[PDB]
Design a binder for this molecule. Structure first.
Ligand SMILES: OC[C@@H]1[C@@H](O[C@@H]2O[C@H](CO)[C@@H](O)[C@H](O)[C@@H]2O)[C@H](O)[C@H](O)c2nccn21
Length: 313
């Protein structure tokens, strides 16, 4: 199931999944371009919104996010184009606080500003989208992304995952942040270990042994639910940073992909790459030189990825 999952050659699509954006002509065209790349997977990623990082409320569905029908439309299109589909609901905060830093005054209390209450809201959201994933035939479901502060609430994560399993029969992953692979204590509750592997160029080769050790320790395959780099100067030193000041630099993004592919071994514990990311509104190829985003389309990284992925299979 997980052990002989085909190696993942994937791309994340459509973040942050603002309401209505995936039902556009642009989105459908962008998806068609995505499916012409040597990818076997797409991740449909979107974010619900927290009013603040200590408020347990989460806003999702219309008018904030893509509707359930928009999700179904994109999944149906991806599937019709021969892609496998991972559904990835997550949360952002309106004030810009990183989702990995949410925190509550209290551990318990359904009506208090508590971890219990937040997990209630979050489990409600994940259960809803896990059900959408099952009905739309999505081959994977990602139960969380980069939730560093939430991770120590192990029993609450296991409750959330158990509920997802009631609603969804496919592969389940949790996506931790880079540097958290060895720290998460509930990997046994998921099928695949994954991370947001935004390792600086210089750090790849030294990090690989720990990634191997984590996979082998937990007897689970490991893959990258996010990995990528903006085409901006200096970005390979801070590939996670989407607001890095700098000149457009296509070569820097290529250097990141070269370093990553050179570092990762051809070993069975590693199950591949969910690249970050592809926009719902895709620029024409000729405009790639003015683009400072994570998108590889029309840049030298597209060819680096092509050379690696076509040869992988
Ligand atoms: O920084 C890259 C990536 C994040 O991608 C961004 O997400 C923000 C909102 O969270 C969006 O406005 C940007 O346009 C861009 O798509 C994303 O949060 C992802 O989960 C992640 N994790 C580390 C780095 N990223």
């Amino acid at each position: 199931s997980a052990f002989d999952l085909g190696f993942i050659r994937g791309m994340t699509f459509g973040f942050v999944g603002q309401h209505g954006t995936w039902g556009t002509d642009e989105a459908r065209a962008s998806m068609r371009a995505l499916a012409e790349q040597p990818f076997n997977w797409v991740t449909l990623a979107f974010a619900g919104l927290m009013e603040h990082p200590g408020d347990p409320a989460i806003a999702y569905g219309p008018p904030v996010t893509v509707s359930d029908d928009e999700i179904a439309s994109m999944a149906e299109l991806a599937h019709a184009l021969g892609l496998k589909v991972c559904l990835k609901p997550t949360v952002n905060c309106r004030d810009g606080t990183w989702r990995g830093e949410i925190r509550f005054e209290k551990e318990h209390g359904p009506d208090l500003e508590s971890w219990e209450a937040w997990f209630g809201s979050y489990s409600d959201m994940m259960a809803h989208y896990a059900h959408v994933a099952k009905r739309t035939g999505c081959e994977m479901f990602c139960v969380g992304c980069e939730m560093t502060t939430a991770e120590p609430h192990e029993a609450m994560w296991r409750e959330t995952i158990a509920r997802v399993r009631t609603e969804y029969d496919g592969l389940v992953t949790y996506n931790c942040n880079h540097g958290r692979e060895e720290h998460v204590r509930f990997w046994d509750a998921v099928d695949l270990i994954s991370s947001s592997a935004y390792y600086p160029i210089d750090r790849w080769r030294d990090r690989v042994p720990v990634l191997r050790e984590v996979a082998e320790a937990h007897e689970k395959p490991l893959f990258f639910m996010e990995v990528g780099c903006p085409s901006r100067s200096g970005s390979g030193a801070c590939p996670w940073d989407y607001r890095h000041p700098g000149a457009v630099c296509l070569d820097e993004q290529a250097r990141f992909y070269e370093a990553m592919f050179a570092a990762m071994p051809d070993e069975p514990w590693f199950k591949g790459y969910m690249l970050w990311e592809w926009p719902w509104k895709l620029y024409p190829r000729e405009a790639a030189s003015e683009d400072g985003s994570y998108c590889i389309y029309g840049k030298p990284a597209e060819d680096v990825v092509a050379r690696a992925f076509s040869a992988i299979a």
